[PDB]
Amino acid sequence: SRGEYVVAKLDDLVNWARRSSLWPMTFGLACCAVEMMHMAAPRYDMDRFGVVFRASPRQSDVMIVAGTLTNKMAPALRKVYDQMPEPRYVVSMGSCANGGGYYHYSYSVVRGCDRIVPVDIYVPGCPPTAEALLYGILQLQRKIKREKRLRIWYRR
Amino acid sequence: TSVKPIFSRDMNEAKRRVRELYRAWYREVPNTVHLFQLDISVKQGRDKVREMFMKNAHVTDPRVVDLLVIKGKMELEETINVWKQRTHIMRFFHETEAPRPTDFLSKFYVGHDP
Amino acid sequence: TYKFVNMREPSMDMKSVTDRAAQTLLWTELVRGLGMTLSYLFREPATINYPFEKGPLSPRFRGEHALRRYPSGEERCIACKLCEAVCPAQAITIEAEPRADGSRRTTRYDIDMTKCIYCGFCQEACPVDAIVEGPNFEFSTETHEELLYNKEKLLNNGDKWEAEIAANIQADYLYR
Amino acid sequence: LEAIKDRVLYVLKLYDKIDPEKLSVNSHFMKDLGLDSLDQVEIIMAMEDEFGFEIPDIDAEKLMCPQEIVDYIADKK
Amino acid sequence: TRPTIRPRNDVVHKQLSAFGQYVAEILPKYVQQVQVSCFNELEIFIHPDGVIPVLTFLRDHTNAQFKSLADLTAVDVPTRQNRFEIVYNLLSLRFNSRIRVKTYTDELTPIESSVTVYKAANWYEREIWDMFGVFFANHPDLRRILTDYGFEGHPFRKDFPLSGYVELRYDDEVKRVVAEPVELAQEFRKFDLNSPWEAFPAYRQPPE
Amino acid sequence: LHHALIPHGKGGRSSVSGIVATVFGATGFLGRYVVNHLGRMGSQVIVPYRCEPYDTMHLRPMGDLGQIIFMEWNGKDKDSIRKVVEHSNVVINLVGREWETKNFDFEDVFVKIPHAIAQVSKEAGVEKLIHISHLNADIKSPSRYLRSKAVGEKEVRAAFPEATIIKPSDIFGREDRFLNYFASMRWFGGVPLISLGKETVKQPVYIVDVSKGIINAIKDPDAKGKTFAFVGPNRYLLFDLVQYIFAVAYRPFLPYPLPHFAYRWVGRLFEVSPFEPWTTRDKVERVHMSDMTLPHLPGLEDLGIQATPLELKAIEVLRRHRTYRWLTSEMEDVKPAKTVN
Ligand SMILES: COC1=C(OC)C(=O)C(C/C=C(\C)CC/C=C(/C)CC/C=C(\C)CC/C=C(/C)CC/C=C(\C)CC/C=C(\C)CC/C=C(/C)CC/C=C(/C)CC/C=C(\C)CCC=C(C)C)=C(C)C1=O
Ligand SMILES: CCCCCCCCCCCCCCCCC[C@@H](O)O[C@H](CO[C@H](O)CCCCCCCCCCCCCCC)COP(=O)(O)OCC[N+](C)(C)C
Ligand SMILES: CCCCCCCCCCCCCCCCCC(=O)OC[C@H](COP(=O)(O)OCCN)OC(=O)CCCCCCCCCCCCCCCCC
Numbered sequence A: 001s002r003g004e005y006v007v008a009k010l011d012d013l014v015n016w017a018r019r020s021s022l023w024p025m026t027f028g029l030a031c032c033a034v035e036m037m038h039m040a041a042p043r044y045d046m047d048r049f050g051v052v053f054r055a056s057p058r059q060s061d062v063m064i065v066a067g068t069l070t071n072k073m074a075p076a077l078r079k080v081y082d083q084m085p086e087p088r089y090v091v092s093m094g095s096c097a098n099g100g101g102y103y104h105y106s107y108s109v110v111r112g113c114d115r116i117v118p119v120d121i122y123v124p125g126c127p128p129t130a131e132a133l134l135y136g137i138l139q140l141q142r143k144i145k146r147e148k149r150l151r152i153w154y155r156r
Numbered sequence B: 001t002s003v004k005p006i007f008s009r010d011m012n013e014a015k016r017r018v019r020e021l022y023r024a025w026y027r028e029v030p031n032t033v034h035l036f037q038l039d040i041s042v043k044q045g046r047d048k049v050r051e052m053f054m055k056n057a058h059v060t061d062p063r064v065v066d067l068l069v070i071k072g073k074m075e076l077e078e079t080i081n082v083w084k085q086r087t088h089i090m091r092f093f094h095e096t097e098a099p100r101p102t103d104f105l106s107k108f109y110v111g112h113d114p
Numbered sequence C: 001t002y003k004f005v006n007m008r009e010p011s012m013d014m015k016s017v018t019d020r021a022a023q024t025l026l027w028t029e030l031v032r033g034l035g036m037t038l039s040y041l042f043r044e045p046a047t048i049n050y051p052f053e054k055g056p057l058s059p060r061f062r063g064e065h066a067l068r069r070y071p072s073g074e075e076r077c078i079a080c081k082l083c084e085a086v087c088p089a090q091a092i093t094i095e096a097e098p099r100a101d102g103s104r105r106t107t108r109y110d111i112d113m114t115k116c117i118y119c120g121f122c123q124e125a126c127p128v129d130a131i132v133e134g135p136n137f138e139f140s141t142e143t144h145e146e147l148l149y150n151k152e153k154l155l156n157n158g159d160k161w162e163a164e165i166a167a168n169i170q171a172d173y174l175y176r
Numbered sequence D: 001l002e003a004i005k006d007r008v009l010y011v012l013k014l015y016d017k018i019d020p021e022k023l024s025v026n027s028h029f030m031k032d033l034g035l036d037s038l039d040q041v042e043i044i045m046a047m048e049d050e051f052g053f054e055i056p057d058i059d060a061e062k063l064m065c066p067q068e069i070v071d072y073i074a075d076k077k
Numbered sequence E: 001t002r003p004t005i006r007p008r009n010d011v012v013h014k015q016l017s018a019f020g021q022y023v024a025e026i027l028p029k030y031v032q033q034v035q036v037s038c039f040n041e042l043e044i045f046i047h048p049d050g051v052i053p054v055l056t057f058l059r060d061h062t063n064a065q066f067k068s069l070a071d072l073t074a075v076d077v078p079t080r081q082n083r084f085e086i087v088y089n090l091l092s093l094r095f096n097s098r099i100r101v102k103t104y105t106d107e108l109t110p111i112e113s114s115v116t117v118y119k120a121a122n123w124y125e126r127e128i129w130d131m132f133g134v135f136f137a138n139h140p141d142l143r144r145i146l147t148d149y150g151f152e153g154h155p156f157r158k159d160f161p162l163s164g165y166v167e168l169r170y171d172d173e174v175k176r177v178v179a180e181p182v183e184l185a186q187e188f189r190k191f192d193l194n195s196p197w198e199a200f201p202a203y204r205q206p207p208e
Numbered sequence F: 001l002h003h004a005l006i007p008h009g010k011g012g013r014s015s016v017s018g019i020v021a022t023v024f025g026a027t028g029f030l031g032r033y034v035v036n037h038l039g040r041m042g043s044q045v046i047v048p049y050r051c052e053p054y055d056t057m058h059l060r061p062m063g064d065l066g067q068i069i070f071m072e073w074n075g076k077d078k079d080s081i082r083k084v085v086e087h088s089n090v091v092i093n094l095v096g097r098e099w100e101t102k103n104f105d106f107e108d109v110f111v112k113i114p115h116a117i118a119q120v121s122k123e124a125g126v127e128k129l130i131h132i133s134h135l136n137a138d139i140k141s142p143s144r145y146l147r148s149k150a151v152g153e154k155e156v157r158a159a160f161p162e163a164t165i166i167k168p169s170d171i172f173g174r175e176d177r178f179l180n181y182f183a184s185m186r187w188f189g190g191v192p193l194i195s196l197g198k199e200t201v202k203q204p205v206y207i208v209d210v211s212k213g214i215i216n217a218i219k220d221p222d223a224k225g226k227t228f229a230f231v232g233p234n235r236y237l238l239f240d241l242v243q244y245i246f247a248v249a250y251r252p253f254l255p256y257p258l259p260h261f262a263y264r265w266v267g268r269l270f271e272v273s274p275f276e277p278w279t280t281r282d283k284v285e286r287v288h289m290s291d292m293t294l295p296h297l298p299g300l301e302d303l304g305i306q307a308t309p310l311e312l313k314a315i316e317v318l319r320r321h322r323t324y325r326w327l328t329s330e331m332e333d334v335k336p337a338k339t340v341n
């Protein structure tokens, strides 16, 4: 149908922009954030793909939870996630962010950042290499490529 | 056996310090509700302060009372300086935990707990 | 021995004073920094073209886990639980029983990849080279549960990566 | 002193734990009214909120009767 | 040669023993015991109320210039009447040496704060309080340093469970993080590793 | 009971409650609350969704690992309905739209879909069915919404005789329509009311109370084939209710009487939006309609729930509508509205 074709093209265009312009919030917790710096480094330059760190959560699209999430830190992470406007995505990085990690059976560690925020991508490793994190970012981009919001709305 | 007192010597001065801390907490609940934008009432906060003070009413050791008032002052200055968030202040109220059964028949039904 | 990083005084002769004044009024060190940045601009970047180009790795690399087999097809693991005992993060859960033919083989071999710290202790403690850490590192998932590997998943990883795992173990086994 | 007395009684009547029927100018807080240390402390704080002057802890412990309250307020003006 | 055995230093052992005798003679009112470990570390056990005099002496004395406080922690031994064991590690740069001073306390007995001798004692004693429950009397700002706000209990105590009693999650109904009793999908599997055969005869205790 | 359906634990996140529930319409207000309560219990939750998977993300943290399962579903596909209800002993139906789109009508969302869910669930052997209806569900009602509600209630009762039909009055909460719809009329100058809201009586019910009642209806063994009425503790006139809403929001209250035909035309104007409409003719009819009184049907007190008065939870919803001048004002600063009991 003409309307179906129009909405398909429009949300192909919309998903392309969001996929190609990703702005992670400048947010790192532990040793996993060093591999974020090495992904930002010249070797695996993240700025090629349109992935740029922004300090303010208002101007951020993705939250890369890279490090251990503690009980004393969970409210701040939830606060910045809430203050991030939509559409927003979450990439947990490393064992600590995925589940508990080396500190799973601890009194002061949250066993998974997905207990706090909805996580879109999980990156495995301790720490995941910069290439592993880049693969996770590209996988997030491909996940964005498949979103059909206007197509869902047209048939709604 | 004579022991080194933390404060308060005998029990009367410990009770005096308890009353001082209770006044400090009682005069703080309106400020806590205003600053943290709590949806609870001021009466609810004062009742919670009273309840938290009353669960230690069986203590008969002045040193334990002194340590309790020290920790109460600590958690009061965390509330005054807004070091705490609404998260902890409402953690005081257990708003999300399901009501645990307390009778033998219900406890027998639910599980193996004593 | 020791040295002073900054304890030098400048000469107060007229030529040196004029040189410093020219540096102050004419921003000489700032121009020098500009020249350094321009040189780096005209240099060649150190960026690889991922995913079409991959960063170098070594035979010792610790990536995704795998359960190996003997060349006959028999599983190497003998349910000895040395890896489970030595695991720092307690990421391995093992349950075993005698098999139909009486072999000492596992029935449950779980690794929580969100709990594992990828430290390589399990493959060091294995006396039969059963559990290994393969070369794979691009195995990120979209859901948490997909990272809770079990015995079937680990055996599939071993069957999938057996050639590269065997080559790496052959390359690096004389150092162990 | 009548103004102080009526203000004290008005404050006491607003207290939830205070029974207006049993309330009187000679009613002992602990015995006649059946309160405890913390209730008396809250009463003293409410009295401070009315007359706007600081009552120390040592003096507040000797204010177990409304007549004692009005005597203390009159002495301190 | 014995390549696999650590060589010993009798010179340093004798020097440490002599200095331990020196300090024990100088401060008989507080020093209870002096030991030199076989890897040349001097350890001084003193009365709990001698902390300020002993530390001030070890800092300001001409023959003991331990001007640096390397560390300050506590050890929990529940089998003792005074379960908590406060440990001070001092470094003397002038004589290129290190010393250890150990005192004892229990739950209800305060220990004098040494922030007037070393400024690092401020945060070190804050951590000791937060993690063990030891109260320090004259501390400029004594409060929690590492645990969460409102956290109940001192976690480094031996009787404190490894996972604690509460855990955190985000509840959508109340639109905030909540604290609920700890519940584990997989329980921490406790291992009994000790062998029933004695390893070191040198440390064998009398049957008593 | 199957060996895997026996409850274990202490009713926590990592426990087992023996409840396997397929929750239709879980990507909504009541849906999110019900899913949160089930996951908090520690139950198995299946979430059939037709929307973009991005719009189901708030439901991910609501349960432990593997306890929330998202599967696609159509509503016109009994195959998908069976696929999602095959392995669950509880089926909860909260599907509904306050407006009508091109593809789904009030007949489709309130008659055809609930009847298909009930019929398919009966074949699949689902033990318990919970079906959400409306308190003012009348066959001769002026509102097509409520007429379809009544027809769908009868169809569900016919298809699944062992059902629990719940009839909330008007759910108010953070993501509700009720308090937000009343508090969003600041932009259109004054507040248009039919007969100035003097001829309408309403007793709204709290969302957490409704979700708790839904959860307790599953656990109660003697609520198998029953009908409940979920209403609040106090009944208000519409004028008093809107006045209290605006007082709590600290907005100037400027009511004015607008005749019913004019308000119907206004609602007709606003329903031409391809997106979610701000108001509709059926919405106007429902807002004007007084809540019914059904003393014979059981309710929250019968299911063990003490209904939360509006004066305790109104500030959660209406603090968002305040300005910076009045953001920090406390809950006790506004006198409670005048009730009609
Ligand atoms: C907190 O812990 C920490 C971290 O964290 C864990 C860290 O990581 C690190 C590590 C730190 C780093 C690695 C440093 C940060 C990394 C870097 C790479 C720094 C580099 C910074 C930059 C390169 C700056 C880039 C920043 C931004 C914001 C660039 C983004 C671009 C924009 C915002 C521009 C968008 C606006 C646009 C495009 C305007 C155009 C729009 C229009 C509408 C114009 C068009 C209008 C028209 C009318 C045109 C229409 C005309 C038409 C159609 C006709 C034309 C004719 C035709 C033929 C077409 C550290 C130290 C750390 O401590
Ligand atoms: C600036 C002022 C506002 C502008 C308003 C719009 C103006 C026109 C917008 C320009 C459109 C640019 C489209 C770019 C197409 C993407 C190129 C191509 O590579 O994309 C492919 C196809 O992309 C998608 O299929 C759809 C892209 C957009 C399709 C066009 C939709 C219609 C656009 C024209 C209509 C504009 C007028 C209507 C709007 C105003 C998939 O690539 P991808 O996988 O990702 O790359 C991965 C990286 N690799 C290759 C290294 C691995
Ligand atoms: C030659 C003639 C001209 C040819 C081209 C004609 C069209 C050009 C574009 C016109 C502008 C956009 C028109 C509207 C697009 C469709 C928007 C829509 O219907 O969105 C509905 C839907 C909302 O969500 P829904 O599915 O309803 O579910 C409720 C959520 N719980 O889903 C959403 O809202 C999805 C979120 C994004 C919606 C806005 C973006 C739509 C695409 C805009 C593309 C152009 C952007 C230009 C930006 C300004 C210039 C830089």
Ligand SMILES: NC(=O)C1=CN([C@@H]2O[C@H](COP(=O)(O)OP(=O)(O)OC[C@H]3O[C@@H](n4cnc5c(N)ncnc54)[C@H](OP(=O)(O)O)[C@@H]3O)[C@@H](O)[C@H]2O)C=CC1
Pocket (backbone or CB within 6 Å): F024, F025, F026, F027, F028, F029, F030, F031, F049, F050, F051, F074, F075, F093, F094, F095, F096, F097, F098, F104, F109, F132, F133, F134, F135, F167, F168, F169, F170, F171, F172, F177, F178
């Ligand atoms: N809310 C209220 O004030 C009251 C509500 N009720 C009833 O309670 C129930 C729940 O209400 P509520 O949560 O507020 O409603 P919502 O509008 O917030 O949510 C409706 C849910 O049903 C889904 N849905 C709607 N239409 C369709 C369709 N055609 N096909 C498939 N899925 C569909 C939606 O999914 P998606 O996002 O994918 O479209 C969403 O998950 C409804 O039946 C309603 O009539 C009763 C009394 C008062």
Ligand SMILES: *P(=O)(O)OCC(C)(C)[C@H](O)C(=O)NCCC(=O)NCCSC(=O)CCCCCCCCCCCCC
Pocket (backbone or CB within 6 Å): B014, B015, B018, B025, B029, B032, B044, B045, B046, B048, B049, B052, B053, B054, B056, B057, B058, B059, B060, B065, B068, B069, B071, B072, B075, B089, B092, D036, D037, D038
């Ligand atoms: P009268 O003197 O006869 O009675 C005095 C009382 C009632 C205190 C007892 O009879 C009594 O003297 N008991 C002896 C033991 C004792 O004095 N215990 C007091 C312990 S101090 C204490 O427990 C401090 C607790 C701090 C409170 C924490 C604050 C929590 C409130 C948070 C705010 C919630 C909303 C803002």
Ligand code: SF4
Pocket (backbone or CB within 6 Å): A030, A031, A032, A066, A067, A068, A093, A094, A095, A096, A097, A101, A102, A125, A126, A127, A128, C117
């Ligand atoms: S997963 Fe490993 S590398 Fe990453 S934060 Fe945890 S301990 Fe550090």
Ligand code: SF4
Pocket (backbone or CB within 6 Å): C083, C086, C087, C088, C089, C090, C091, C092, C111, C115, C116, C117, C118, C119, C120, C121, C122, C123
């Ligand atoms: S690499 Fe280390 S942490 Fe991971 S499973 Fe092996 S022993 Fe355990």
Ligand code: SF4
Pocket (backbone or CB within 6 Å): C076, C077, C078, C079, C080, C081, C082, C083, C084, C094, C122, C125, C126, C127, C128, C129, C130, C131
């Ligand atoms: S160490 Fe090797 S043989 Fe032993 S249980 Fe582990 S994988 Fe099996």
